[PDB]
């Protein structure tokens, strides 16, 4: 804190720089503090009436927090192309948070007009959790992100967790948080916040698309030394016996290689198309789905283990829930039509992932005789294999950038489903509230809890910056790579710009890979 | 109206016991219920469900 | 015939929650019985009544 | 432990000095200890059938222990002779304690007849816990004792220990000792055993007899200058008027004159005669006796708090369990007549405590008035009072020396009822026992409990020396004491001395106070 009331706590730094070896990224905004719940934590559960798979249990906190998890609040659509373009991987080395200017206003409802005036007295208090003692609800991709265009104000939203349940009713270890029993520091209206964070290390995105599938890591000049089965049987006569041949594998063959390496794992999706008229008539929403079933109930698996999207000349085709969609500027929250939303593809990983839509290989059911013909079935899903590799899903860019591994006795591979940098130790959760003030007790003395407090809300400005570390490219590819480009030809309206009536919108996602590299 | 803070130290006595047998000890019920005890309800308010007395750990006389 | 003797040092993690209520907790039943838990029976045979596993304590996924 | 087979590892101090301000004390024994269960603990309960008050329930180890708690373990009939009669009172400072020339034997039962062998390689195990961390036995009074006499060979009694129960059913705090748990250490034939102990503070013992009664603290030659109501009513004619008149008390009264003290408090006992014919001729003895519930069970009060006994010149009673009784030599377990016991009498505090089997006084219960008449009542118990004083009981010879406070929130005075010093940290128990040897494993394994044992026992010397304090007396008492003599009459056998077939016996029990203070 510091001197107040006429002197500003703080200014505006919000810029971007770039040093030729890192970024550095900074933003600000403007935000609105509502009291929530009237002062009163409150357990929630589910309805009465509910699929056994819609229960919950929880509480819901006066408290409230802020959230940047999305590239869009770090990135402009211009600063988001020194990255794609010219970049090979980035990570998230550093960053900074601050707030400051709060100012505290009271509402008075008399008669049927509200009228609102400073209090100079109140305070609000925040803190910083940073030993993860609280349910961490960051990572879950909720709505109430920083906006993406600098001048628009947004809302705070509410905290709340859930923990253990049995139908609807709780189980003896749930475990209930009081957010007034840490430590936090109250703020009046001259005083400030500040707090700096360190990321632990990270591996690189990969901002890369191969050149190379997996299927052609050789020269077609040169035969391999290594024999396969050709053909298993011989015409001796009109009729054939059975007489095994062998064979080298050269460029006219290619399938029947040997290679050192596999696709990576699949768990498979099922298939629809943007053409209306080619989906069957039903409702498979629900019954086609992918799941996974714990505990006796089932949950969709939203993205899904990582795989290329479309396969190869047909772009119609996505898995059902196998991709990320992202909204339309302005779309209602339920049964919106489909040119509203904003589907992404993922069509870059075809050289390693298998498509999400057909199955890995085919394996041998039984054991060949004479009497007995061989026979063959489809895997329809994999674990891991030694010997495979795979890449991950991008980033895009109002996509998140991190999340949280669970606290547990074993991981396998960290990188998170959505997309974005796994971390053991996130960036804490920032919470806030405004303190209650009491109003004009009774002048006997009562012991119950008071009902009734003075109607006020806070308002002020709010910083946060990002170190980001950059890996160039190298290449000596001869001819010209792919760029991300904005259309030359004329628009009523540019493309992330606002409209006439100051609505700023975003017009398709962005993703991160573009340059190409070989495998 | 404003705010008030306290403090309080408090010092503490352990127990060194050759009792070979497990000790009773204050555990809250693992059955299911409506409501989880010590803590708010639907309403928000907060109620204890029953006294807890000091002395389970055993000292020989 | 002789006698043995083994010795292990063993490293503890401890514990720190902000949970408002009461974690469960291993109790032995307070009520009568004919014959103690994890004690000798009247013809000096020793028994274990029941297995006991190690996670009680409560910690957020 | 040291070099052995063939040295021996200790030897016979056993001696008393005096230094003119403090005593010291040693003993010599030897003894032999069985092994006890067949190397195993059991739970012991009280019978099926019993009185609600006589249910128990608790464990009998293979261990077993050394006890001395009594005074004629210490001390000679001779040297307790400097002590009561030079002496006003006396602590004990200091001890000491060790065991020496330990020496195991195993027993071959074949045929009819046995035989015994050294063990050369057996060892015995022993420890003291000094943290009282076990259930203390000591201070109940049990038998056991090392030998007044020095010659006689004694055996190591069993122990064992109780808990909380319900009927004969243990109640769930109930706790069960290991006492392998324990440190101890292993002993072979020419290792040895020390340990040594500080008393805390403790107030010296009394051992002089007042000779001033609280009746009279005053000289008869002067009255006072108080006055006290003589007499209610004065006869103004045939028929008397009330008018109160007051005096001074003088010599002719002194039942009437103002103190500053009273005597200590009672809890009444009933009271019997030595005589057969007087007693009444039923059965009085549990139901005439005095008790205390606890827990809904009833239990005898044996020592009870001190009281002088038998009153005056009446020798022929005494309180009905409000007096120690010791057995002479030889004498059966139960229903012994009364020649065969030795009852103690204590009449040495008449000057202070009340009589055992009489009323503490009377107080009024009712208000008088012109038509009511006084009334007043016989009280028979009395806590206490601000300022009362009191003496405690003899410790006599045979009796015990000190017992444990328990631990508790509180406790009014700790010195203990049977007789001795309070400690709330006494000398410690030791603890001793014969290590098991298999006999004979089976060819094959087995993974079963060992139910065969090699037979043996083990016998050795055990050493105590104490240190006691003294306190002198200074008197300018003209005329002289009362002092302990032996009778000088012929007789057919000396008191406290071997008989013909080397029985040694004590003929009477000996009290501590003879010298005389004034109150």
Same mark, same amino acid.
């Not at 919950?56 to 999305?70: I, K, L």
């Not at 009271?106 to 100079?120: F, R, S």
């Not at 053991?424 to 007790?441: G, M």
């Not at 710009?497 to 398709?508: A, F, L």
């Given at each position: 804190?510091?001197?107040?009331?006429?002197?500003?706590?703080?200014?505006?730094?919000?810029?971007?720089?770039?040093?030729?070896?890192?970024?550095?990224?900074?933003?600000?905004?403007?935000?609105?503090?509502?009291?929530?719940?009237?002062?009163?934590?409150?357990?929630?559960?589910?309805?009465?009436?509910?699929?056994?798979?819609?229960?919950?249990?929880?509480? &819901?906190?006066?408290?409230?927090?802020?959230?940047?998890?999305?590239?869009?609040?770090?990135?402009?659509?211009?600063?988001?192309?020194?990255?794609?373009?010219?970049?090979?991987?980035?990570?998230?080395?550093?960053?900074?948070?601050?707030?400051?200017?709060?100012?505290?206003?009271?509402?008075?409802?008399?008669?049927?007009?509200?009228?609102?005036?400073?209090?100079?007295?109140?305070?609000?208090?925040?803190?910083?959790?940073?030993?993860?003692?609280?349910?961490?609800?960051?990572?879950?991709?909720?709505?109430?992100?920083?906006?993406?265009?600098?001048?628009?104000?947004?809302?705070?939203?509410?905290?709340?967790?859930?923990?253990?349940?049995?139908?609807?009713?709780?189980?003896?270890?749930?475990?209930?948080?009081?957010?007034?029993?840490?430590?936090?520091?109250?703020?009046?209206?001259?005083?400030?916040?500040?707090?700096?964070?360190?990321?632990?290390?990270?591996?690189?995105?990969?901002?890369?698309?191969?050149?190379?599938?997996?299927?052609?890591?050789?020269?077609?000049? #040169?035969?391999?030394?290594?024999?396969?089965?050709?053909?298993?049987?011989?015409?001796?006569?009109?009729?054939?016996? &059975?007489?095994?041949?062998?064979?080298?594998?050269?460029?006219?063959?290619?399938?029947?290689?040997?290679?050192?390496?596999?696709?990576?794992?699949?768990?498979?999706?099922?298939?629809?198309?943007?053409?209306?008229?080619?989906?069957?008539?039903?409702?498979?929403?629900?019954?086609?789905?992918?799941?996974?079933?714990?505990?006796?109930?089932?949950?969709?698996?939203?993205?899904?283990?990582?795989?290329?999207?479309?396969?190869?000349?047909?772009?119609?085709?996505?898995?059902?829930?196998?991709?990320?969609?992202?909204?339309?500027?302005?779309?209602?929250?339920?049964?919106?039509?489909?040119?509203?939303?904003?589907?992404?593809?993922?069509?870059?990983?075809?050289?390693?992932?298998?498509?999400?839509?057909?199955?890995?290989?085919?394996?041998?059911?039984?054991?060949?005789?004479?009497?007995?013909?061989?026979?063959?079935?489809?895997?329809?899903?994999?674990?891991?294999?030694?010997?495979?590799?795979?890449?991950?899903?991008?980033?895009?860019?109002?996509?998140?950038?991190?999340?949280?591994?669970?606290?547990?006795?074993?991981?396998?591979?960290?990188?998170?489903?959505?997309?974005?940098?796994?971390?053991?130790?996130?960036?804490?959760?920032?919470? #806030?509230?405004?303190?209650?003030?009491?109003?004009?007790?009774?002048?006997?003395?009562?012991?119950?809890?008071?009902?009734?407090?003075?109607?006020?809300? &806070?308002?002020?400005?709010?910083?946060?910056?990002?170190?980001?570390?950059?890996?160039?490219?190298?290449?000596?590819?001869?001819?010209?790579?792919?760029?991300?480009?904005?259309?030359?030809?004329?628009?009523?309206?540019?493309?992330?710009?606002?409209?006439?009536?100051?609505?700023?919108?975003?017009?398709?996602? #962005?993703?991160?890979?573009?340059?190409?590299?070989?495998?």
């Amino acid at each position: 804190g510091a001197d107040g009331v006429g002197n500003s706590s703080g200014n505006w730094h919000c810029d971007s720089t770039w040093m030729g070896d890192r970024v550095i990224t900074t933003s600000t905004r403007t935000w609105a503090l509502p009291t929530y719940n009237n002062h009163l934590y409150k357990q929630i559960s589910s309805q009465s009436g509910a699929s056994n798979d819609n229960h919950y249990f929880g509480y &819901s906190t006066p408290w409230g927090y802020f959230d940047f998890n999305r590239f869009h609040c770090h990135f402009s659509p211009r600063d988001w192309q020194r990255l794609i373009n010219n970049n090979w991987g980035f990570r998230p080395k550093r960053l900074n948070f601050k707030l400051f200017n709060i100012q505290v206003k009271e509402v008075t409802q008399n008669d049927g007009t509200t009228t609102i005036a400073n209090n100079l007295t109140s305070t609000v208090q925040v803190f910083t959790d940073s030993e993860y003692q609280l349910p961490y609800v960051l990572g879950s991709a909720h709505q109430g992100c920083l906006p993406p265009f600098p001048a628009d104000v947004f809302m705070v939203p509410q905290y709340g967790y859930l923990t253990l349940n049995n139908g609807s009713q709780a189980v003896g270890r749930s475990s209930f948080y009081c957010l007034e029993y840490f430590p936090s520091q109250m703020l009046r209206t001259g005083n400030n916040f500040t707090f700096s964070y360190t990321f632990e290390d990270v591996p690189f995105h990969s901002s890369y698309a191969h050149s190379q599938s997996l299927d052609r890591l050789m020269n077609p000049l #040169i035969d391999q030394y290594l024999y396969y089965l050709s053909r298993t049987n011989t015409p001796s006569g009109t009729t054939t016996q &059975s007489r095994l041949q062998f064979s080298q594998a050269g460029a006219s063959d290619i399938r029947d290689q040997s290679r050192n390496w596999l696709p990576g794992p699949c768990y498979r999706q099922q298939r629809v198309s943007k053409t209306s008229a080619d989906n069957n008539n039903s409702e498979y929403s629900w019954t086609g789905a992918t799941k996974y079933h714990l505990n006796g109930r089932d949950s969709l698996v939203n993205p899904g283990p990582a795989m290329a999207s479309h396969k190869d000349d047909e772009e119609k085709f996505f898995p059902q829930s196998g991709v990320l969609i992202f909204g339309k500027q302005g779309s209602e929250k339920t049964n919106v039509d489909i040119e509203k939303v904003m589907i992404t593809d993922e069509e870059e990983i075809r050289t390693t992932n298998p498509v999400a839509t057909e199955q890995y290989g085919s394996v041998s059911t039984n054991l060949q005789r004479g009497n007995r013909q061989a026979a063959t079935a489809d895997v329809n899903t994999q674990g891991v294999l030694p010997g495979m590799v795979w890449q991950d899903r991008d980033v895009y860019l109002q996509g998140p950038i991190w999340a949280k591994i669970p606290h547990t006795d074993g991981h396998f591979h960290p990188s998170p489903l959505m997309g974005g940098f796994g971390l053991k130790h996130p960036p804490p959760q920032i919470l #806030i509230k405004n303190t209650p003030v009491p109003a004009n007790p009774s002048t006997t003395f009562s012991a119950a809890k008071f009902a009734s407090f003075i109607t006020q809300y &806070s308002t002020g400005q709010v910083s946060v910056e990002i170190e980001w570390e950059l890996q160039k490219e190298n290449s000596k590819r001869w001819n010209p790579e792919i760029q991300y480009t904005s259309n030359y030809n004329k628009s009523v309206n540019v493309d992330f710009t606002v409209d006439t009536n100051g609505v700023y919108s975003e017009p398709r996602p #962005i993703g991160t890979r573009y340059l190409t590299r070989n495998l």
